[PDB]
Write a protein that binds this DNA or RNA. Structure first.
Lengths: 147, 59, 272, 123
RNA sequence: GAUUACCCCUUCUACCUUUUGCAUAAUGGUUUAACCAGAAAAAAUCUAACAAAGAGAACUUUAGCUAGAUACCCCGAAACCA
RNA sequence: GCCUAACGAGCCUGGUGAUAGCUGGUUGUCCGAGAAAGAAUUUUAGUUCAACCUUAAAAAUACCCCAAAAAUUCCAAUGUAUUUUUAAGAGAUAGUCUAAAAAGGUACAGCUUUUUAGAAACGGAUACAACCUUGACUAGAGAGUAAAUCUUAAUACACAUAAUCCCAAAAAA
């Protein structure tokens, strides 16, 4: 083919590939790392920062996640409002008993770089406490990497 | 035999007399090797700045 | 002095809102003579002969008609430039014919496995007006071209270019021409467009014709797998085979487009 | 006696000519144009200095990706390439990591071969 | 810098003045135009004239003497006197 | 208090461009070299020569310096380059911190008063004057490294707006 005068290689953009990640005892935040790698598209040799070539990751069985140590009761999630004394402390236990899909999502929410692309790639992430996937009627690729 | 002196560390932040020693060894730059004869006069100065340099015997 | 710079700035600022048309006679700053141009033309290119035919090659009928028109209008004197056009049209005629023959020989020798339809298509694309005229303008032939009305329009530069061709055919013979043209045209193509304009109508059916003509085997399309995406485009994996042997495989957004691309890749695959 | 004449006006005209495409008074006023021009040149130098760093990091990321596809990480691949006496730059290596998976697959195969031979010779 | 004929992402703590140190929440400025603040040769260095003499009736002179060329910016009081 | 809207002594004009060691200011390019404290002063926010520095020439030699000897004061040798002599000309003299040794203070201070040393890209330390790495040509879609970045230490028959000692997590070459 042809190449001219010192240029980086990117053509236009491509289509993202949807991936599936299993639950059941994989460490929280340890999965969020590689899920953020797949979210950014760092696993693809064609990766570009501005192009946002990141894929769409779907994880299942988020309630079956297992955190080691005593961190179950000892982890405190802080939620503060505009009102004075609106500081709220929610333990990982109670949060798991209420809204588990939030936990892992938060573990991902700190991994990604800031500003736009964070929320942009955040919309590419979906979590469910139990397995129901109408999106599985649509054939997708499954990747298995347990810890 | 003959000893070759190489500068692996800066003379900056160090006393001026050490810089004078390095100038005596003929090192104007880091990592630059210099061939020198073995004598107590040179060996002493070599022992002064030894912590700032690496010396290897050759030839 | 500030007056000369204010006048230069005012002229340079006046040329922004006013654009004058390009003139052929006032184009070159130095005096333009026939011998100077043909001399440089002889020094640059390998071999150049028939200076009269070369000068005639850059002569167009419009300039002659305009000249004779001015001769009739003013009525001062009368001269005959008539022979120029009559000598040019013949060179152009032979030029076109020999160009067709030469290019046909090129496509015949280079790609023997290319079907007649492909040969016709590639010849039609290679002899196309727009491309050749583009090569002309890129070679700055318009500077050597003589046109009274306007320098720009393609019917001038194209006929002029073909006249130059025929001139090289008569003067320098075929052996030199084959060196000249063959170098440029190939370098100009560079694209997939060559087989794309022939694929504009029923790619599948064309592949059917080629396969039935060569191996006498009906092509079969079979979906080997599907990876769906509801948001942007779904991806279907389409295989294309003959006699259980897979010819090609490829992804597509829709079944139609997938089959089109598969048929295209398979089309260029059988080109060799 | 001299005069201000066209000198200052021409200098301002030049600075403002270089101040085009700028936002607001900086593409209009002279002083802000100069102030923005200085910053523009400093940023030119600095970004032209860090461009190599950004490209290097990007290439390292790409090669890391292509390597991880083959089961090995970036540092191991680098070490193996060093002991293979390969001076190939990471730019061309990334270009091969994109367009020509076969060459990178061969280099990765030789990498795993050298690693297995070293691990078998050490034992 | 990349990128599309526009933008998001990434890389960066205004200028000046005053200071050990200012993006500093120290100082001055709405913007633009214009106005606006280093002009003194003794000894010296240097370029030439002549040389125990130079220099246009005056001075210097154990190589001098004569000539030319080189370095020391503005605004502001409270008050005093007639 | 008042004496033409402000009187510890009116206003106008002139002396007058009064005096200001103060404060606020002082405009084109490129190249080389490049300063933070010795004693005095009706002096400390200013000056005068040393401690330095710069220009242009000459005659010298100088330093790092071991045993003869009294942390140094001296001197071979070493590998070095400089050290002045003379001729003109500057500016600077209200500075800090760390490390070490001191003094005052309370084995307080981003504390003060001295001696020695270092110090002041845009790498590292989250950002940040000295701490760590490095001495400073332009250009280049090259390469090799320096420091650094994420963790290590435990058992008994208490301040005041929203959290974590820089994200999220992790584990115990």
């Amino acid at each position: 083919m042809s190449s001219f005068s010192k240029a980086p290689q990117q053509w236009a953009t491509f289509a993202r590939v949807w991936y599936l990640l299993d639950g059941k005892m994989q460490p929280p935040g340890k999965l969020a790392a590689m899920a953020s790698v797949k979210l950014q598209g760092l696993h693809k040799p064609v990766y570009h920062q501005l192009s946002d070539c990141g894929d769409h990751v779907v994880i299942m069985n988020t309630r079956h996640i297992a955190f080691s140590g005593n961190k179950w009761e000892q982890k405190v999630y802080s939620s503060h409002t505009g009102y004075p004394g609106g500081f709220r402390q929610v333990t990982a236990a109670q949060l798991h008993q209420k809204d588990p899909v939030a936990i892992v999502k938060l573990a991902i929410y700190g991994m990604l770089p800031k500003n736009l692309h964070r929320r942009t790639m955040m919309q590419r992430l979906h979590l469910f406490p139990d397995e129901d996937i109408p999106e599985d009627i649509l054939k997708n690729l499954v990747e298995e990497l347990p810890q | 035999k003959l000893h070759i002196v190489t500068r692996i560390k800066s003379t900056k932040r160090r006393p001026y007399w050490e810089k004078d020693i390095i100038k005596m060894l003929g090192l104007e730059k880091a990592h630059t090797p210099q061939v020198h004869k073995n004598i107590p006069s040179v060996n002493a100065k070599l022992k002064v700045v030894k912590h700032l340099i690496r010396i290897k015997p050759l030839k | 002095x500030x007056x000369x710079x204010x006048x230069x700035x005012x002229x340079x600022x006046x040329x922004x809102x006013x654009x004058x048309x390009x003139x052929x006679x006032x184009x070159x700053x130095x005096x333009x003579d026939y011998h100077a141009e043909i001399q440089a033309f002889g020094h640059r290119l390998q071999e150049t002969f028939s200076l009269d035919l070369l000068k005639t090659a850059f002569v167009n009928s419009c300039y002659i008609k305009s000249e004779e028109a001015k001769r009739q209008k003013l009525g001062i004197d009368k001269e005959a430039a008539l022979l120029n056009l009559k000598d040019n049209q013949e060179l152009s005629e032979q030029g076109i014919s020999f160009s067709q023959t030469c290019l046909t020989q090129f496509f015949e020798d280079a790609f023997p496995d290319l079907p007649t339809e492909g040969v016709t298509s590639l010849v039609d694309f290679l002899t196309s007006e727009e491309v050749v005229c583009h090569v002309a303008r890129n070679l700055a032939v318009e500077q050597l071209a003589l046109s009274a009305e306007f320098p720009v329009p393609p019917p001038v530069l194209r006929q002029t270019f073909f006249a130059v061709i025929g001139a090289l055919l008569q003067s320098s013979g075929p052996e030199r021409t084959a060196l000249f043209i063959r170098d440029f045209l190939i370098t100009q193509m560079t694209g997939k467009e060559l087989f794309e304009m022939w694929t504009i109508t029923n790619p599948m059916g064309l592949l059917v014709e080629e396969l039935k003509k060569r191996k006498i085997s009906a092509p079969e399309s079979r979906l080997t797998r599907q990876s769906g995406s509801t948001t942007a485009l779904p991806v279907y994996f389409v295989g294309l085979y003959c006699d259980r042997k897979l010819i090609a495989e490829g992804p597509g957004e829709t079944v139609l487009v997938a089959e089109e691309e598969a048929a295209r890749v398979a089309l260029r695959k059988l080109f060799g | 006696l001299r005069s201000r004449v066209t000198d200052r006006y021409w200098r301002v005209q030049e600075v403002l000519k270089h101040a085009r495409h700028f936002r607001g008074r900086k593409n209009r006023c002279y002083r802000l144009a100069v102030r923005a021009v200085t910053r523009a040149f400093v940023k030119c130098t600095r970004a032209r200095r860090l461009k190599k760093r950004s490209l290097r990091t990007l290439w390292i990321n790409r090669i890391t990706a292509a390597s991880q596809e083959h089961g090995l990480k970036y540092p191991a691949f680098i070490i193996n390439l060093i002991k293979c006496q390969v001076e190939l730059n990471r730019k061309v290596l990334a270009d091969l990591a994109i367009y020509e998976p076969k060459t990178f697959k061969s280099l990765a195969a030789l990498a795993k071969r050298r690693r297995x031979x070293x691990x078998x010779x050490x034992x």
